[PDB]
Amino acid sequence: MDQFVGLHMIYTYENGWEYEIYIKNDHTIDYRIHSGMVGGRWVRDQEVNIVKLTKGVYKVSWTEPTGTDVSLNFMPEEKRMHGVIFFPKWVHERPDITVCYQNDYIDLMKESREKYETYPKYVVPEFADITYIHHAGVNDETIIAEAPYEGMTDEIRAG
Amino acid sequence: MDQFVGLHMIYTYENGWEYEIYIKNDHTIDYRIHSGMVGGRWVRDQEVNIVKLTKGVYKVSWTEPTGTDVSLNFMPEEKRMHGVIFFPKWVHERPDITVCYQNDYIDLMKESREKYETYPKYVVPEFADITYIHHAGVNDETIIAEAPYEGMTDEIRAGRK
């Protein structure tokens, strides 16, 4: 677990969606979505379950204020990951509602998830290629601290 | 994938609860719960996402008519699995509703998930030991074809099937 906790990664799913994650500590992540259905969305201080399945394979799972459920597996040695995201129907129907700095709009997310339809869920299971991976250390509050913008991931990769 | 698809497994939690799964084909499972809060529940022809993450590590994920979301990992060579289940609030309060041959009560599951509370959800992540594992072959409709009963897991292990 000490090899995984503290990792800062960018990855592109096979559907082309580019995501950025920071494993801030053994039960918390920050993340930033750069493209795809909810590009522009970003989140800090998401509580998560993190386990090591076996040598080189980790699992990060959580549920969100929107109702979305997520289970990710990371294979850092192979620069691969796989994610399954279970979106409530309303998120698929109105992804714009969730596209914000979520921490400023928690009440809106919870209000929406009670007021709109949940079923059937829109489930997205895909592999992704890890294109950036760095051990950034634990509890660095500055890694993910602004909204995503065009070209940001190239900047991060360029150093 | 050909090592994993067709597997019939029982896995047992630390508390003794026994869960049974059959990887019927590369996008379908049957399952049967033998003990615990939803003992008696069983399901056929559940559509799933199955992938091989790396050598010896597989992932099976799906959402259910009850609204429950599931993502399991299997590590057959180490005889271990890890599951995370995201239960709607109502399944936590009325698990008995889900205890049945689900296929005969799809309408009830869907009525329930709309009528009762969804949130807050209960996220339940736990390892289990794989305590039975047998390649039963693909698309065998006879593996999970009846409701569970006390002693059935013993019969499965003793009959290798």
Side-chain angles (χ1 to χ4, degrees), chain A, chain B residues 1-160:
Chain A
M1 284 276 304
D2 68 338
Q3 295 296 311
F4 180 74
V5 171
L7 283 177
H8 182 201
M9 294 171 285
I10 307 164
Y11 45 96
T12 309
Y13 284 100
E14 305 268 13
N15 62 5
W17 295 6
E18 187 172 45
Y19 280 65
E20 177 190 356
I21 203 170
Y22 171 42
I23 316 293
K24 183 150 59 180
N25 60 50
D26 67 11
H27 63 100
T28 314
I29 67 171
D30 300 329
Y31 68 83
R32 190 152 49 186
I33 307 185
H34 295 272
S35 69
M37 184 177 83
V38 290
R41 176 171 160 83
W42 62 296
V43 169
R44 288 173 51 80
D45 292 333
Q46 173 64 62
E47 173 77 19
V48 296
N49 175 253
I50 299 174
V51 300
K52 175 176 182 186
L53 296 178
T54 182
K55 184 180 172 60
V57 184
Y58 302 84
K59 183 177 183 172
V60 182
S61 312
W62 70 92
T63 190
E64 309 195 335
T66 55
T68 296
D69 297 329
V70 184
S71 182
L72 308 184
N73 295 103
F74 287 90
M75 293 76 72
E77 293 302 320
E78 297 183 48
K79 298 326 161 216
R80 297 288 173 280
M81 66 80 63
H82 184 275
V84 55
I85 305 163
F86 304 90
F87 291 105
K89 179 175 178 167
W90 71 266
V91 178
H92 186 228
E93 298 291 334
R94 287 291 304 272
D96 59 294
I97 294 168
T98 73
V99 172
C100 61
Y101 177 41
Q102 180 176 250
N103 298 61
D104 278 349
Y105 299 94
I106 302 286
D107 291 355
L108 177 64
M109 301 304 100
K110 297 192 171 190
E111 153 184 333
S112 300
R113 75 184 186 181
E114 295 287 7
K115 156 174 59 180
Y116 309 126
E117 302 196 321
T118 303
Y119 308 106
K121 302 202 187 183
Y122 176 61
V123 184
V124 179
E126 297 273 8
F127 281 101
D129 297 324
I130 298 171
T131 63
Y132 177 82
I133 180 165
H134 179 62
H135 204 280
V138 169
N139 292 315
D140 186 336
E141 302 301 343
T142 68
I143 308 289
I144 297 181
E146 66 174 304
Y149 55 75
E150 165 61 37
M152 186 189 263
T153 55
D154 294 333
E155 293 179 10
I156 294 168
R157 281 184 292 262
Chain B
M1 203 72 55
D2 66 310
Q3 300 292 103
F4 182 77
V5 176
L7 284 178
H8 185 202
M9 292 175 283
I10 300 167
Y11 54 94
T12 307
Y13 291 92
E14 196 186 345
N15 65 4
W17 293 7
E18 283 185 298
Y19 284 32
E20 173 198 357
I21 191 171
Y22 169 48
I23 314 304
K24 188 148 65 183
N25 58 50
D26 69 9
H27 62 100
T28 315
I29 67 171
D30 300 334
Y31 78 75
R32 188 154 51 187
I33 306 179
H34 296 269
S35 40
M37 195 63 78
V38 292
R41 177 172 166 79
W42 65 293
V43 169
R44 283 174 51 86
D45 298 330
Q46 171 66 56
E47 174 75 21
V48 301
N49 174 252
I50 303 175
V51 299
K52 176 182 192 172
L53 299 177
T54 189
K55 184 180 187 282
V57 186
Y58 302 87
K59 186 181 182 167
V60 183
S61 313
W62 72 96
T63 192
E64 305 204 315
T66 55
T68 299
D69 296 335
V70 187
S71 192
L72 312 182
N73 291 104
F74 290 90
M75 293 73 71
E77 182 162 14
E78 308 181 14
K79 300 211 150 72
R80 289 285 270 176
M81 65 80 67
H82 183 274
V84 63
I85 302 183
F86 306 84
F87 287 108
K89 168 80 164 151
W90 76 266
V91 171
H92 181 257
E93 307 305 331
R94 304 289 288 281
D96 51 295
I97 293 175
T98 74
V99 179
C100 62
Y101 176 41
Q102 182 174 251
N103 298 54
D104 274 358
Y105 296 94
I106 297 291
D107 292 347
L108 177 64
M109 298 309 104
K110 293 187 175 187
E111 282 168 330
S112 296
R113 71 184 187 184
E114 301 288 6
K115 174 165 139 188
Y116 305 129
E117 291 298 299
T118 302
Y119 306 106
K121 296 225 212 86
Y122 289 75
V123 182
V124 179
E126 198 172 348
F127 284 102
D129 291 322
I130 297 168
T131 57
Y132 178 76
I133 177 162
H134 170 60
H135 199 96
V138 175
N139 292 315
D140 187 334
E141 309 296 349
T142 72
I143 310 296
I144 301 190
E146 70 180 308
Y149 50 75
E150 289 174 352
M152 178 179 281
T153 55
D154 287 323
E155 299 174 6
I156 291 168
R157 297 198 188 80
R160 190 69 171 169

